[PDB]
From a paper:
ATP synthase is a unique molecular engine that uses the rotation of its subunits to perform the catalytic reaction of ATP synthesis and hydrolysis. Here, we performed structural and functional analysis of [name] ATP synthase to study the molecular mechanism of mPTP inhibition in this organism.
We then obtained maps for states 1, 2, and 3a, among which state 2 was the most prevalent under these conditions. The state 2 map was used for further analysis to generate the F1, FO, and Peripheral Stalk (PS) local refined maps with nominal resolutions of 2.64 Å, 3.39 Å, and 4.01 Å, respectively. The overall structure and subunit composition of [name] ATP synthase at pH 8.0 is similar to the one obtained at pH 7.0. The main difference  is the lack of IF1 in pH 8.0 structure in all rotation states, confirming the pH-dependent binding of IF1 to [name] ATP synthase. In the maps of [name] ATP synthase (state 2, pH 8.0), each non-catalytic nucleotide-binding site in α-subunits is occupied by an ATP molecule with an accompanying Mg2+ ion. The nucleotide-binding sites in the βDP and βE subunits are empty in all the maps. We find that the overall structure of ATP synthase is more stable at pH 7.0 compared with 8.0.
Numbering used by the authors:
A (entry chain N): 4 to 219
B (entry chain G): 173 to 220
C (entry chain 1), I (entry chain 2), J (entry chain 3), K (entry chain 4), L (entry chain 5), M (entry chain 8), ...: 1 to 75
D (entry chain R): 2 to 106
E (entry chain S): 26 to 101
F (entry chain K): 1 to 102
G (entry chain H): 15 to 148
H (entry chain T): 3 to 78
Write the structure that this text describes.
């Protein structure tokens, strides 16, 4: 029924089991020389760790793994959720808000507690005039306040729109007419390649933005 | 070695060199040839 | 009557959001022309990044068309 | 909490193979002659810790068969996708049945 | 796929007309297994399989029901 | 006994189905036994509409086509990249052992 | 930390000297050069090169024309024909040069060669006046 | 693959017996439910006519009242 | 005929999406001008990319026009 | 009465759509200025490309104006 | 008075088309600044092209303004 | 009674045509920045065009705001 | 039911706001093409900021798409 | 009743015009990034132009948001 | 009840202003790609200008988004 993908109230075993899916798809290491999937997963993680270390800095020892785990959580829910009957956890705004709000609070509160006057000088972007200074302060306060909203919305609303556009094409895929079915399947192949790329891009966007907010 | 404009524009590494039109490369090889001839003239005069 | 009529206005006003897809596609492929003219040896890698920009612009425009079709039929 | 199970003896069983059951040698369910199947079911305890141990042993057997070998393929990942899609269809049994195409069938 | 067609010819063919007295001797043996034993002496792997096989017979019955009713999805 | 690492994983027919499922029936139903059991199962699910052909069946079909095309096009390249890395690691460990002996 | 070579037929100014930044006036517009700037080539114009030494000192050199070569190894080779320090300039001679250049432009008439000479001398006169005043 | 195996005659006989039973059961049930569907369509035609007449009258009156209310709001 | 009236407003609102095609076409051919100015020895591939960009941008504009006609007459 | 009012509203909403054509024409002619500045020996081929870009953008703008006049009069 | 009412609304919608002229003129004169900065030896010739871009870009917006008058004092 | 409603909606819709003027002003001053960075010697000529461009990037925009009063009090 | 009808018109009018995100994504990936073709030694690092340029602009357009659900499934 | 309702409609339609101020601000500060990357020694003078662009760009927004509230209350 | 309905229409038309913030953010970060392609050693101050410029442009869009919660609730 169009929106029936986004109904977690399914049965006695609800659709919240879509969050235990990343425990199944995480590589387990037994032998000393790794297998193909373990080596591929470790190579991707090492590559992203090297990319995020440039933006992090030396005073962010905990940000090596705290953003990588968030990247894998978002990536697995976005990627394995696009398979047909699997519920997509990050489509809902609750899960994305649950990921974005606590780390943003852990950035804002810790920066205010640790360096207060440095943050107040950081409000002025080093050259703006004093009459525009209160406006820049208000701009900085508002822009920091809508940071976790613009992460949760950008992940949840994008995943919802990405699966509703597939559901609209699926509902028009009649089985009696083979021509319409072949058009629907070909257009869904184009759309699903776009959705897989958008899924990985949006997880990388969240990792990059959490790293930038952690360092700043 | 001395290379002309066409021998430089057709090179493999010249695609890595930015802001290159025909006029810039033409002017560059004209002055680079003049500088190389000057350097060879000074060394030849000292050697002679 | 009234609810059925205004769904046409909602769908037509949501159709304007594919103008941004048309502008984004034009900017991507125009700059691909500039990128190719600057460095023709990388035309295989320039075209690969321009396809990504075309895909993301298409993604925004199709999202607007999805909302247009949603208001037109799904309610 | 992480520790080896109490039946594991590193001086007897060699290196730790998590897919192996280190307890007393019970008859596997495949070769039970079904006249003693109720006795076999009563012999195995139904504790949630033992159930989670049997699930973990089975998951490590599957890891050892399809993932842990060096030149492993994408067959384990397709098995996970199909197994998750079937399970999530059985979860949404009502949500898909209530939108059928035929009536009587 | 030609070998699959060869196996279909070998294995998906109706039984021989001369084995009707034989299979009844088998069927009554199942009756002899329905009263005395020969089933509580069955390994669960084998028992699993015997059930599995039977489910295949019942699925052939539903395929025949699809043939008799024409279309596959429902009764049209 | 000590665990051993086989070079090749378990045998798989039709992309993901294990080969042990197909060879389990060979004592009774031959080679087309399991295949006709799966065919009868899929026909029975689509007959009684237990498996309802919804808007997600065509998503699953498009995923299956994309997955087959992507795996058949990039499986050799990705397996070669991974086995190159594993060989480099094993070579580095062997070089360490030889250097320690020297 | 940029290897900035600045030479001329008359003098050699820097030879692989480490320089923070160089402000080159080129034919493709006056652009600045930093370490690992870009691999471009350039053609100089009559203008002022500003050199930022490692101690923070800023020096200026008038360049008539030459070649600028920023390579991949952050090495810059500006090679003018007549590069002088800007402190060694005459403002009055610059104004006389510019006035004579405008006189030659006016008196060129239909002579396109002398017109080009007058235009070039006008550019040099303007650059010399701006460098002496600057 | 492996060399082909002839199936057990009891398995083949039961499988094709179930196929035949499926064909005749599908024909019988389709013939049975065709009359039921025809009777359901017969009564649903009258139910559709009554529902269409009542709903169209109610929709037309509600549309008239809604247009009068919106003209009152707009003042035209 | 209020529903037909709302269809006409929806069609008029859905025809603005061709503005994005107009801007994308301008960007493509404006950048073709710059690209041919820089590298005039590759004008066949530049015109190929300009044709591809113009075709994709005009395809988005015709998609907006198709939606402007689909809710107008068909639905 | 309501139908003529909705035709007026749709005609206004469709005449919005010449905005992106105006932007594309502005981008084409500005980029012609830049390309001629960086290479004044090709002022005839670039002007032809500018004419082609402006003709296509004004074609999209006239398509919006055509849809405006069709909704105002034809249907 | 719903006919004159939607005349005012349709005219107000048709006056959005001046935005595209405003952005087109800004892009023309922006590129005139850059094209003068790169090659200032042909400036008046560049200036003539800028006038021609203005002579098109404002004209497109004026056509939308003309449609506002056609929705106010002509139809 | 609905004429006041028509004037309010028409002025509200007419007040979007200055968005394009704002984008043109942003483009002009952006390209003034770039053209001054490239060639800072002709600063008093670049400003001599940019303000002219800014006037022509706003003369159209205020015309839309002129309609936001002409639809509102004059007509 | 004027409330539900104007909620549909409100959601349709708010869905135009994703056009700016589509144009911004196109400009980001277009300038990614230019930046990679000019300095291909930083192909990853430019791409990282290009991905960052894909993020924040999209965070504006999908914000309008949030209202496209807020007026429907929240209000 | 209808006048206050249409004042809400006109104020909502007038608040679109701050989009053009937002785009002009983005173009100004984007080209400030470009211009500073050529002559960082002009990092004050370019920034003065960038502030001047913002001091005009948001002024267009300060017209349109004003033309919301003046339409919402005063007019 | 037309008052609440027109608040919904005004809120929907107010949400269109976030598009221009999205386009301004795209221009800022696209130009960050171009500026970083020519002077990577300045990138931190270049990055700071983006974090300046985007923080202005997005803020203008949020002002329109603030009207989506100001013309909807408080007015
Ligand atoms: C960058 C670096 C890597 C990044 C990280 C990668 C991590 C995984 C690596 C796997 C390690 C490995 O072994 O690789 C070597 C592996 C090669 O192994 P191999 O077995 O030696 O080579 C196979 C040969 O081609 C031999 O096979 P073949 O070519 O002869 O063809 C086999 C098969 C071709 O088919 C396939 O194998 C592909 C089919 C996939 C589609 C399945 C969809 C099912 C949905 C149904 C829902 C209902 O064709 C058939 O025999 C026909 C049967 C078709 C399959 C069944 C179709 C199901 C339909 C519905 C059933 C009901 O290569 C790859 O896996 C390449 C693809 C890369 C992995 C993609 C990841 C998939 C999803 C993973 C889970 C989510 C992760 C999230 C992150 C996503 C990415 C960012
Ligand atoms: C649809 C397919 C998609 C899902 C495929 C997933 C396959 C996983 C099972 C792999 C397996 O059997 O070996 C691993 C491993 C082998 O254990 P083992 O029996 O001690 O190994 C000794 C030998 O392998 C001796 O055991 P074996 O593996 O040789 O035993 C084979 C025997 C099965 O043995 C038994 O007595 C039954 C026990 C089954 C074990 C698997 C339980 C969990 C399965 C989850 C299903 C998810 C969907 O085969 C059957 O009788 C199965 C026939 C069932 C009907 C299918 C008829 C053919 C269909 C053809 C259609 C084509 C058209 O199985 C486990 O005990 C753990 C299973 C993994 C569970 C977690 C991962 C699930 C991934 C989703």
């Amino acid at each position: 029924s169009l929106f029936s993908v986004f109904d977690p109230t399914s049965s006695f075993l609800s659709n919240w089991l879509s969050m235990l899916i990343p425990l199944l798809f995480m590589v387990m290491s037994f032998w000393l020389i790794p297998s193909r999937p373990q080596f591929l997963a470790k190579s991707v993680l090492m590559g992203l760790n090297r990319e995020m270390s440039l933006l992090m800095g030396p005073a962010s020892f905990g940000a090596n793994i705290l953003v990588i785990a968030l990247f894998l959580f978002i990536l697995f829910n976005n990627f394995i959720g696009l398979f047909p009957y699997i519920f997509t956890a990050t489509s809902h705004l609750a899960v994305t808000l649950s990921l974005a709000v606590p780390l943003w609070i852990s950035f804002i509160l810790y920066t205010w507690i640790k360096e207060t006057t440095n943050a107040l000088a950081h409000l002025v972007p080093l050259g703006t005039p004093a009459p525009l200074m209160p406006f820049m302060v208000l701009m900085e306060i508002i822009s920091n306040m809508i940071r976790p909203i613009t992460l949760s919305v950008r992940l949840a609303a994008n995943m919802i729109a990405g699966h509703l556009l597939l559901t609209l094409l699926g509902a028009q895929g009649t089985l009696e007419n083979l021509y319409v079915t072949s058009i629907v399947v070909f257009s869904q192949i184009i759309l699903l390649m776009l959705e897989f790329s958008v899924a990985i891009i949006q997880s990388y966007v969240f990792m990059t933005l959490m790293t930038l907010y952690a360092s700043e | 070695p001395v290379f002309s404009k066409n021998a430089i524009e057709s090179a493999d590494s010249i695609a890595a060199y930015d802001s290159l039109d025909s006029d810039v490369i033409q002017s560059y090889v004209e002055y680079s040839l003049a500088s190389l001839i000057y350097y060879t003239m000074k060394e030849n005069a000292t050697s002679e | 009557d009234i609810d059925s009529a205004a769904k046409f206005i909602g769908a037509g006003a949501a159709t304007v959001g594919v103008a941004g897809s048309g502008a984004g596609i034009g900017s991507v492929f125009g700059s691909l022309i500039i990128g190719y003219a600057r460095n023709p040896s990388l035309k295989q890698q320039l075209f690969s990044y321009a396809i990504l920009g075309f895909a993301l612009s298409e993604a925004m425009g199709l999202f607007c068309l999805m909302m247009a079709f949603l208001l037109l039929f799904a309610f | 909490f992480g520790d080896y199970p109490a039946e594991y003896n590193p001086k007897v069983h060699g290196p730790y193979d998590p897919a192996r059951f280190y307890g007393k040698a019970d008859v596997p369910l495949g070769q039970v002659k079904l006249g003693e199947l109720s006795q076999w079911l009563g012999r195995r305890n139904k504790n949630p810790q033992a159930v989670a141990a049997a699930v973990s042993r089975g998951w490590w057997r599957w890891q050892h068969k399809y993932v842990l070998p060096r030149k492993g393929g994408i067959a384990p990942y397709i098995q996970l996708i199909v197994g998750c899609s079937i399970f999530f269809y059985a979860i949404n049994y009502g949500k898909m049945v209530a939108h059928r195409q035929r009536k009587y069938h | 796929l030609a070998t699959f067609l060869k196996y279909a010819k070998v294995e998906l063919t109706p039984p021989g007309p001369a084995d009707v007295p034989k299979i009844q001797e088998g069927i009554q043996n199942l009756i002899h297994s329905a009263k005395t034993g020969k089933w509580k002496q069955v390994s669960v792997r084998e028992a699993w399989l015997n059930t599995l096989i039977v489910t295949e017979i019942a699925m052939w019955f539903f395929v025949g029901e699809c043939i008799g009713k024409g279309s596959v999805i429902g009764y049209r | 006994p000590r665990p051993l690492r086989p070079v090749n994983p378990g045998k798989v027919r039709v992309g993901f189905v294990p080969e042990e499922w197909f060879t389990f029936f060979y004592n009774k139903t031959g080679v087309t036994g399991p295949y006709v059991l799966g065919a009868g199962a899929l026909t029975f699910l689509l007959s009684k509409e237990i498996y309802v052909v919804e808007h997600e069946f065509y998503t699953g079909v498009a995923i299956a086509i994309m997955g087959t095309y992507g795996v058949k096009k990039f499986g050799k390249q990705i397996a070669d990249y991974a086995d190159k890395g594993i060989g480099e690691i094993e070579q580095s460990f062997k070089e360490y052992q030889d250097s320690s002996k020297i | 930390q940029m290897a900035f070579t600045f030479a001329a037929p008359s003098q050699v100014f820097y030879n692989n000297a480490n320089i923070r930044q160089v402000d080159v006036p080129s034919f493709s517009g006056s652009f600045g050069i930093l370490p690992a700037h870009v691999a471009t080539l350039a053609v100089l114009k009559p203008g002022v090169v500003t050199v930022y030494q490692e101690d923070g000192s800023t020096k200026k050199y008038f360049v008539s024309s030459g070649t600028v070569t920023v390579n991949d190894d952050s090495s810059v080779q500006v090679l003018a024909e007549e590069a002088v320090p800007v402190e060694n300039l005459d403002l009055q001679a610059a104004r006389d040069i510019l006035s004579k250049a405008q006189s030659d432009v006016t008196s060129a008439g239909a002579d396109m060669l002398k017109l080009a000479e007058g235009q070039i001398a006008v550019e040099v006169g303007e650059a010399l006046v701006k460098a002496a005043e600057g | 693959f492996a060399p082909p195996v002839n199936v057990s005659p009891l398995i083949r006989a039961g499988r094709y017996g179930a196929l035949v039973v499926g064909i005749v059961y599908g024909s019988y049930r389709f013939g049975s439910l065709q009359k039921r569907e025809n009777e359901w369509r017969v009564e649903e035609a009258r139910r559709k006519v009554i529902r269409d007449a009542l709903n169209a009258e109610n929709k037309a009156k509600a549309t008239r009242e809604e247009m009068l209310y919106l003209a009152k709001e707009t003042g035209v």
